[PDB]
Amino acid sequence: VGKIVAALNARAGRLDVMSQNPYNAVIHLGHSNGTVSLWSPAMKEPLAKILCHRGGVRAVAVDSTGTYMATSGLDHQLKIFDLRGTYQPLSTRTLPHGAGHLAFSQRGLLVAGMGDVVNIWAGQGKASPPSLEQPYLTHRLSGPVHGLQFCPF
Amino acid sequence: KFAYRFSNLLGTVYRRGNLNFTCDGNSVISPVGNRVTVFDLKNNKSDTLPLATRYNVKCVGLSPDGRLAIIVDEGGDALLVSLVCRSVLHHFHFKGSVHSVSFSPDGRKFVVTKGNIAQMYHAPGKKREFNAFVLDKTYFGPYDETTCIDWTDDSRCFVVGSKDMSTWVFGAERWDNLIYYALGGHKDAIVACFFESNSLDLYSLSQDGVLCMWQCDTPPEGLRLKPPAGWKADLLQRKVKYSRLAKYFFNKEGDFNNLTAAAFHKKSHLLVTGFASGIFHLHELPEFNLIHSLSISDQSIASVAINSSGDWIAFGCSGLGQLLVWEWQSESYVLKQQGHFNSMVALAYSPDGQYIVTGGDDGKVKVWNTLSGFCFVTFTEHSSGVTGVTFTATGYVVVTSSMDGTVRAFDLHRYRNFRTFTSPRPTQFSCVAVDASGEIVSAGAQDSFEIFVWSMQTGRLLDVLSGHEGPISGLCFNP
Amino acid sequence: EETRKIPVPANRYTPLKENWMKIFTPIVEHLGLQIRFNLKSRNVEIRTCKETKDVSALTKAADFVKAFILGFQVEDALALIRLDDLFLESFEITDVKPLKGDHLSRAIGRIAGKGGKTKFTIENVTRTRIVLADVKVHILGSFQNIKMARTAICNLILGNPPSKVYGNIRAVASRSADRF
Amino acid sequence: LDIETRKIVREFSGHQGQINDMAFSPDGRWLISAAMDCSIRTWDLPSGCLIDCFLLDSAPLNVSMSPTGDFLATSHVDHLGIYLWSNISLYSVVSLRPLPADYVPSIVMLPGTCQSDELIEYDSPEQLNEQLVTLSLLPESRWKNLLNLDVIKKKNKPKEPPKVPKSAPFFIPTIPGLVPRYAAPEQPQQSKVVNLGVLAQKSDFCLKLEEGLVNNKYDTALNLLKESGPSGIETELRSLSPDCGGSIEVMQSFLKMIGMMLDRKRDFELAQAYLALFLKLHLKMLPSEPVLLEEITNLSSQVEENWTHLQSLFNQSMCILNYLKS
Amino acid sequence: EVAPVSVSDAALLAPEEIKEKNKAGDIKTAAEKTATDKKRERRKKKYQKRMKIKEKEKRRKLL
Amino acid sequence: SADGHSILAGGMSKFVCIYHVREQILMKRFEISCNLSLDAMEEFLNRRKMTEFGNLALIDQDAGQEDGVAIPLPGVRKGDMSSRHFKPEIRVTSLRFSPTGRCWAATTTEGLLIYSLDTRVLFDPFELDTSVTPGRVREALRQQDFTRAILMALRLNESKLVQEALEAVPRGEIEVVTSSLPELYVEKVLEFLASSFEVSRHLEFYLLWTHKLLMLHGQKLKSRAGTLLPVIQFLQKSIQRHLDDLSKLCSWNHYNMQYALAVSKQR
Amino acid sequence: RTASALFAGFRALGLFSNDIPHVVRFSALKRRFYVTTCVGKSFHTYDVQKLSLVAVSNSVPQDICCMAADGRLVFAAYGNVFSAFARNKEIVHTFKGHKAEIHFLQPFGDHIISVDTDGILIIWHIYSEEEYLQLTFDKSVFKISAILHPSTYLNKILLGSEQGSLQLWNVKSNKLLYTFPGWKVGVTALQQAPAVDVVAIGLMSGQVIIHNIKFNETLMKFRQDWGPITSISFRTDGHPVMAAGSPCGHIGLWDLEDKKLINQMRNAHSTAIAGLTFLHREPLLVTNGADNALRIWIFDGPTGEGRLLRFRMGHSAPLTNIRYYGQNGQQILSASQDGTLQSFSTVHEKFNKSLGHGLINKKRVKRKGL
User: Fold this and answer.
1) I need a labelling partner for B167 at 20 to 30 A (CA). Which of B72, B398, D15, G170 fits?
2) Location of the Glycyl lysine isopeptide (Lys-Gly) (interchain with G-Cter in SUMO2) covalent cross-link (chain E)?
3) Contact A98 B184 (CB under 8 A)
C-alpha cells in the first residue's frame, strides 16, 4: 500500500542485531544487556524478553522451522535455544574467536563467521539441533566477514 | 639579505589530540593542528617545535625520563623526537590508524593500539638502525577497536579498553597464573581504565557514564614466571580471579550526558572527568566523593590530563579550541586561552613592534604580546565579523571596522571603547585606514561604493567621497 | 604480639560507650586488630593477631582511639587512618606566657571569643580543628595549617586584639596552597 | 671568491688527488669537496679551516647537499646507486674542532651501512667588572608582578564559584608543593600525635637569615629566595613579621642582604623587587624600631646613587633617538 | 584575561570621572565672588531657560 | 619590507613570494604549511584514491561532518555551518611586516605565523679578506689594539666575535674606540647593540657604549635619518624595555624610604 | 673512534638487484608469496602480486654473499659469519665459528647447514645457536659446488662437486650412503624436479641432466652452448616445461614430455642470470640479474611466447651526474652511462620515475620500439 503501519520505540539504545523467525513472523532484537526481545507490529511492548548471554549479544539466527534459535555474544559462547515453549539452551560451546554473524540453511546447517574464517556445523537434524562438537567444513576468507546467507534451493 | 626562519605559531592553542604534562610537571604539551607547542607555565613562555607533519597529530606519547617523545599523525606516520634538543630523531610508519600510544613507567617498552590489536615494542636504544623500533609482541583480544592503555607501576601487566564494551588485561611477560583476562559489566564503549598505586585493582569507565570497580585476590608480587618448556627445557636438561564490588553513575536517571574524557592520579587517588555538556567533576575514588564540579564551555571536553604532582589539570575543547589549566586547590586558572579555527582574517603591528592586533569572523579583537606568545586583552563589543584592524602612529590606540556597520576605537591605557563611528545610511564596512597624525579615520563599504571619513577628536562624519564604481578593494594613507 | 594501653577519663566514659560500635568497626575489619576495653583498669587495649597484615596499623590505631578521648569527633579522628599527612599538636596555654588566675581566665576568653566566634573563625580560615580543654589546647590538621593556627593562638594569648590577628592570618592563609 | 667584490676570500688546500665535485651547505658556511684520493673534506668558510675528513673504499664522483640540509648524497665511480649520509648536527649537538690541514684519514667508512684560536665560540662571564652593574636573566614573571600580586590573582578566579556539595567530608588529600617552604615535615612507625616544640616552627628561609647575621653571609638565603615564585615570596616576607612569628632581629639580616646585593651590583632587579615588596608589607611597623632605620639610611643612599647614574644614561639615549626621528 | 604577569597598570577610570571638574577648574565661594561673576551667572542661567523653553515648545508641536 | 627593497605577495596558495622590486624577479618562495589535511595543498590529486565512479569525496565529507555541534547548511563558504569546515582550504588571508624590521607575520588558515631574523639561515659577510679571520681578531685583542680588532670583527658578521671584541674592551677606552670608529660601521654597531640588550646581562655596559656612539655621531646620523628608521626604532624599543620597569621599581623604593625618613624626624 | 664527526651513512637509493640470486618465500597467516633480493649490505622484500616493497632489512657490516629463506626466517651470510633475520627487518640470531667465507646455506627444519670456502660443513640449531655436527671434505678430492635436500627424504642431503662426483649423505647417521660417479665436467646447479626421486643437474659445459637418484638412471639430457648452467626451475602449472639460465643472459625452455627445445628467450637480462624460479602452480617466471632489474615473465601468449608482465628497475650502468631537484628535497635527478635520465625519491620508492632515453625522432620510436 505504501503506508507505515507501526513505529515502535524499543527503549534499548542503539539497534544493530536483528532477525526474523520465518515460521513465527516475529522480529528478534539483540541488545547489550544480553537479552533478546520478541516484537510484533500490534503491541507497543515486546512479546517476550529472553536472557541468553552474560555479555552483549552480537548475532542471532533461527531455523526455517522456527524450532531452534542460535545466538552469540561477547562472552565467546555459542548458544542454541529451543523456541518451542521451553527457551532453554540446548547446547553450549566456547570459541577462540568471536562469531560475528550466524545463518541457517533450509536443511538445518549452521554457519558462524568469526573474523576472516567461516565454520559450518552439521547435525542429523531429524528432530535434533545441530551438533557443536566438531565443525563440518571450514574456509578462510581474504578479509573479515561482514555478511552470510545461504542460497534457498 | 632575506634570511628569515619560522619562530612560533600564534592564534591556536588546541585543535585535536591528547594533552600531556612534561615529566617535571611545569610545562604542558599541546597539539596544534599540524604542529606541537610546549607551554612553559613556569616561565610564561610558548614555543612551537620546528617539526612539521603531513597530517594532524592524533597521538603524543612521552617517555618517563622526559628525553624522548613519539608524535603520530592521523595517517599513521610517526616521529621520534628528542625534547631536550628539540629535533626529530627518527621516522616510522605504522601500517594502520593508532588510537593511543603509552610508555611503560620503567621506560623499556611501549604499547601501540591499532585496529583490533595491541602491539608491544621495545624502547629505542642508543644504537642507530634503519628501523626505529623492534616489535616484540602482539595481542589480539577484543572484538572491536581498542581505545585506551594503562600500565601497572611494576610494569608487569597492562590493561586496554576497547569499543566492544569489554576491557582486556594482558601481561608484559608470559605469566603462568595470568596470560590474559577479560572484564565486562558495561553496556557502552569503554573510554578510560586505570590501576591502583601498588595493585592490579582497577577501574573501568564507560561512555554511558558508568564507573565499575574490579578486584583481584593476588598481590602484584604474587605474579610468577612460567615454567620453562619447549627448546629451553632441552638445553637445561643437559589463575587469578576478578570480582565487581561497586558500580557508580555519574548522571541522574533521565539525563544523557556522555562521558568524553577522564584522568586519574594514583597517589592522590583523584579522578577528573569531563563530559559532553562541557562540565567536569572531581572524585576521590575508593569512597567516590564529589569534591567540586565546574562548567567550562558549551562544547564537549575532548582531552584531559593531570601532572605528576596532582595540583594542575589540563582541559582541551575542540569545538572552540580552548585550553584551560585548572588548580583545584587554589580554585583558580593559571592558563586559559581560546582561538577559533579559520577565523583569523586581520593583522597589524604596533608602531614599536611590541604587540599584535587581530580580528576574526567570530567578531573578537585580540591583542597578543610577541615575546610571551599569549594574548593579553580581548574586546567583544563588535557583534559581527571584524573586517580590518590598524594601529595609530603615535598612541596605543587600535581602530577596527566590522560588518556591524561600525568602526570602533580602543585605547590600551584604560581598555575602553571610547569612540564609535557609524554611517547615516545603514552600510557595512570592509576596511579601515587612519592618518599618521591620527585625526582622520576612513572606511569603505561593500555596497554604497563610497568612502566615509570621520574626525577622531570630534567623532562626526567629515565627508563622503564618491566617484568609484563597484566595491572598494582597499584604502591606505600615505605615511 | 605487642600491645599499648591508653587511659580514658571519667568525662569521656559515656561518649565512648555511645560510640563504641563506631570505633570498633574499622579496626577489626580494616586493620585486623583485636581490642578489649578493660573495665577495672579504665584502659583501652589494642593488640595484634594472626589476621594482622601490616605493622603500621598498630600506630594508627593508637592515634585514632587517642584523639576521640581528646574530644575530637569520630570520623574527624578516623581521617588519621586514611590520611598519613595529618598531625595533632598539643600545648598548654602557660608555655607562651606565665599567667595566673584572672589573667589566665581572660586569656581563655580571648581565644574562644564571645559565643565561640573567634575560635570558629580561625577554624574556617586556617583549615583545622581545635578543642579548648581549660589551660590545654589541642589542634588537628596538616603541617602548614598546624603552624598557621598556633601562631594565631599565640598572638591572642600574649595580648594582641583579635582584629589584627584576623587580618594577618587571612592574608598569609591565602598563599599557602598556590604552589609556585 | 666574492661575486660582488671580485676578490679572493678563502684559500683551501690539502687534497692529494683531482677534485671531482663540490657542494655547499644551504646556509653557505660549509664547503664540501670530493677528490680522487677517496676522501671527502668539509671546510668551514667563516674560520677557513678543515673540520672533517673521512676516507672511502671507492672514489666519490659527485656530491650534493639537500636543500633542507638533512642528508648528503654521493655517487661513486663504478657503483649503480646513490648513497645518503645523515648530518648528525641536526639531531645532536656537535662541537666543531679544527683538524690539521695535512691530515690523512686512517679509518674508512663503508657507504651503505648505518654502523684553539681558530675555533669560533665564546662564553660571557657573570660580571665584566665589580663596579659594572649587571642584571640576572630570570623569567620576567617571577619578579615584575610582586607589587601587583593582589589585583592579578582575583582576576584569575572564575566568575562563577565552583559548586561544592554539602555532603562532602571535611578533609581532602593535600599536595605539599613544588618547593618546600618549611624544611622538615616530620621528625616509619613513629606516632602522629605529638606535643608542641617537636614539629618545625621556623621557615627554612627564616633559619638561613638567623645564621646569616652571625657570619655576614646570605648567599644560601639568597638562593632559596630565587627559586620560589611570587606567591612564595609574599608568604616568606609576610611571615617575617613579629605578628607572624619572625623576630625583629631577623629583618635586620634581611636588610643587610639587600645592602650586600647592591654592593656587588649584581642581580640588581631582584634587589629592587624584593625590597619593594618588603616596603609595602611592613611600612607601618618600620619607623618605630630604631634598629631598622639605620639600615634604611644606608639603603636609601645606595639606591639614589645607583638609579641617578642609570636614569641619566637612559634619558640622554632616548632624547637623541627621538631627535633623530623628528 | 588570566596571566601570571600584568601588562598595563591603570585606574580603569579617567581622573575626571572620579572627581568632576568645572570648566574653569576652580571653585569660588559666594563671598569672594565679584560683581562681574554674579552678572555672568545670571546671564547663563537666563540663557539656559530661554533655549529650554524653545525645546519644550518644539517637542509639544511634534506631539 | 621596512627598507622597501623587497615586496611580499600572497594569495590562494601555500607559498608566500618575495620579489626584488627594482629587478622585477622573485627572490624567494616560502612554504607556509606542509599539512596535507587541508584542501588544495597539492597540484595533482592522488591517483590511488580514484575508483570507477570518481574519488567519492562526499563520503569522507560526511565522515568529517560527524563532528556534530551544528548542522551543515548548503552553500555556506565559511563557519561552523559551512559544509567544508573539517578540511578548510589553504589561504594566506593577510601579510604584514614589523616596523622594527626583525620579523614579519601572516594570518593564514593555520593561524598566525611569525618569521624572525636568524643568523644561522645565511652567511652574509660585508668585506672579507685573507687577513680577516678570528685568529687575527684574538691576536689583536691580545695586543690591546681594540679599534682594529673591532673593525675586522665587524667585517665578519658573526655576532659572537663582535660580542667578545666589545666585552674585552675595558671602560675608559670606550671613547677612543668610538672616535676611531668610521661612519659606515656605526650602523652595524648600533644594530649589534640593539640585538644585545635583549639577551645580555650587562645592560649598562652596552648602555655606555650606545651613549658614546650616539653622543659623538648623532649630528651626522641626523642627515641620514630617513634610511635608518628601522634600526633606530629597534634600538629605541630595546632601550625602552629595561628602562620602564626600572623606572617603576627604583622610584617606588626611593621616595618611600624618604617618607619613612620623614617620619623618623617628626617624632 | 668514528671516522666522521659531521656525517654518518643512512641508506642507499636506486638499487634493486645484484649478483646474489633471489629466493621465493611463502608466508603463514598470509596466503601470498614474497620475493627477497639482496641489495648490497641489506635485502628487500616484495609481494609477487604487484611488486610492491613491504620491508627493508637492517644493514650488516660486510656485503652479503649468500642468502637463504625457510618461510619463518631469512638467512644472510657476510664474511665468515652469518645471521638470521626475523620480520624481514632485524636480526635475532647470529652464528660464529667459521674461519672462511660461506657460499652455501641450506635450511633444514629447525637446523641450518652452512658450507665454507675451505670445505667445512656445519649444522647449527637456529635458536640455541649450538653446533650439531661438523664435517670436513678434502678440497683437492671433493670441493662442494652445489647442495640439495631432496623432498620426502629423511635427513638426507645431496652434495655436488667441481670434480664431477656426487655424494648422498645422511646427517643423522653421519655416514655416506652412496657415491655417484657422475660426469667429468663438474656440477654447477642442483634442483628438485616435480617428482619424488628425480633431480636436475647442471654442468659447466652447458648440459642439463635429469637423473633418478634412487635407481641411478638418466631420463633425458639437454645441452645449451652458452656456458655453465646458472639455475634451473620447473613449471608445475600442468605443462612440462623446464628453464635453464646462462651467463650470457639467455634462457632456454625445454619440453620434458617430448624431450625437445620449446623456445629460447634471448637477452632476458643484459648481464648474467642470477636466479630464475617458476611460481608454484603458476605460469609465471621470476628473474633477476646484475643489471639492477627484477622482472616477471608470463607465458600466456600463443606458442608459449614469454612476455614482460612487471618489472622493478633502476640504472643499469654507473652513474655520471646526480643533483638535488626541488627546494623540498624529496627527489634527486640522476644520469647514467646507459643514456637515461631518472628521478629517485628520498622518502619512498613508489614515487620513483624515469624520464626515458635520449632520442631524436620520438615518433619513429613509437613505431618500432626502443
Assistant:
1) B72
2) 19
3) no
